[PDB]
Amino acid sequence: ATFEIVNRCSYTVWAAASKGDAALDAGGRQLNSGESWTINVEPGTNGGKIWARTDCYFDDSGSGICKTGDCGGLLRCKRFGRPPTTLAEFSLNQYGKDYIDISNIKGFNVPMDFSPTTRGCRGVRCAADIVGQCPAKLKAPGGGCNDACTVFQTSEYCCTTGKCGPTEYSRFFKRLCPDAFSYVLDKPTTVTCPGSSNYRVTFCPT
Template structure:
């Protein structure tokens, strides 16, 4: 991820050169439009239509009604973007619904933070663009590119790590749904940090602050717990099997965005595991690479009972247990909390990948359905022995079913086929 803000190369001068350039640009736009059309936003996925919050008059202070419509920019919600990586990034923001932030694409130097706001009904995604060549309103980036524009109008080109939000989800529009998504691939470590509001200040930080770190050099030493983006009272549950030396090989060889050359002149190449991979090694998802119905869960495979995890999804779930790894990964990847408070997207966060949903799935299910953190939940959130008793991501992903997964599976399965 090197900094590069030099003006782009000059255009070809001849008419034939211009014609070739226009054709190439048209093909690029066509390919990116297909990626944009295939994007699965959380609020459009069927499971996001289900409302976990019980319809109760006590939950609505206005005339005891279960629903209300929020006006535009009523109580603006903080959306903060922080770059903890060693190089400049160019974050992009795509808005699916509601009022988006004042900027949808900007430069963010290493160590800098950008403070923005969105409307309380906003739904969209945030990602990081890398190695961009910027000139005025254009920005051509190695990963996460937005049709060559600095301000993004659509989602970024794959592969890209995503932070996805629906701030007014469910039937009552009183819940926030969010996730870290690797459905479009992986390019940067990413964390989501919750900034509580008055009505959500009692939610333990180790219930909500998820992280996905699958790049060598960014992992702290293996440990089941830590205090990054939380505090010593509420230890964060971590994935504890990966190391900085071993995590570089998690991406299936053929899915690397930039496959390194193998020794042996291509005649008798060494096995994949003998080829050193670069630290910055973006990984395409199986869907992004093949665009097949089986990998993208479309067509005849648009069914959770038919569409299964790919090798990519299995690997992604091991290194980032809380991340969304394929289209029907809602059960072990979706966070649902009462609406309110602000959000911070952190690129290259400290610590390790979190393992929150496998550890506190039952408690998060109760929070989603009841909207209240009980004293029993808080005590369990402070219990290191309990966290250490829950298996980490070393267990096969298909064998880890949390309490939240059970609730989503039992209640939402019928909705997924709608």
């Protein structure tokens, strides 16, 4: 499957693509404002994620640091990134279908649209000013708006027992971005697309 990753933000982002134990394609790249990066994702990929990283510094070897979404100091991510990170999540070719969603379960850093470029389903978006409106206890100094699990590490926020409810903090994310997951047991906002669809992830869509 082809994913086109587009940075419409006015600032540079460092896109990342991983399935948690391996890079997807090159795993990461700098995107200046307006740039587009096309990656190929193997059919059958389960549990892939794409995200943006902000305020990164990398040396010649591709080692450094980012203020949001750092993936162990690497330009080319092999593992998932440090919150806060708005996530585009996908599982491809699962019994004939692809499944896509956007998640705020690991917080929010950059607004995002995740849409198919082929026919047969709808896209999803979270483009509200979550950082600007972020509750004071969830604000991350380096930028972004953390989820409550990251901040407080309780069974209720992290849904550790598999039983949890919405919270004041999850409802904040949900009010601003209804079509994104706000906590682990949220009513799913997953979209089912035809197997072997292609996609575009746009940072700062509006």
